[PDB]
Design a protein around this ligand. Structure first.
Ligand SMILES: CN(C)C(=O)c1cc2cccc(F)c2o1
Length: 168
């Protein structure tokens, strides 16, 4: 039962903890609440491998400046959660990558690209754009709706896979 450090990254309004609450107790909150530091643990069987998920929710606001390259190193897998509602959240992911790369001390890294708010008719960015960008970094793109839990399960298992494939 291995514990993988899973940390989510994104902006305010995307719903990073939405995926976690949907997995822990399986509940979706309507009233968006800005989270600062929350830890979620649950025993899940990954492809037959019973593991313990040690997920940590990070702040979506750029408050921490000279304090990010501290706990960001302990993070194993990062969840690039963006929203198709606003392209701003899409470009925000880029900054996180640049930061993560310096913290990982390597060019390559096992990560996944997930597009939230896929169930909303407010599509500012298209699938091809996300797929195109994902192909450059060699990361898989999965559509994820936190409103009805669409693609969340798939994305979760795919992420853990990338981590295990990276080592084994
Ligand atoms: C109960 N949890 C989540 C921890 O003690 C932990 C710490 C931590 C730091 C960076 C990234 C992570 F995923 C992390 O998990």
């Amino acid at each position: 039962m291995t514990e993988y450090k899973l940390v989510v990254v994104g902006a305010v309004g995307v719903g990073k903890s939405a995926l976690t609450i949907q997995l822990i107790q399986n509940h979706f909150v309507d009233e968006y609440d800005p989270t600062i530091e929350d830890s979620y643990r649950k025993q899940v069987v990954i492809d037959g491998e019973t593991c313990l998920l040690d997920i940590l929710d990070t702040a979506g606001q750029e408050e921490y400046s000279a304090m990010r390259d501290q706990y960001m190193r302990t993070g194993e897998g990062f969840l690039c959660v963006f929203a198709i509602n606003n392209t701003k959240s899409f470009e925000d992911i880029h900054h996180y990558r640049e930061q993560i790369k310096r913290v990982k001390d390597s060019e390559d890294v096992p990560m996944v690209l997930v597009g939230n708010k896929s169930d909303l008719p407010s599509r500012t960015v298209d699938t091809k754009q996300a797929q195109d960008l994902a192909r450059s970094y060699g990361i898989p793109f999965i559509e994820t709706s936190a409103k009805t839990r669409q693609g969340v399960d798939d994305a979760f298992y795919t992420l853990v896979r990338e981590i295990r494939k990276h080592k084994e």
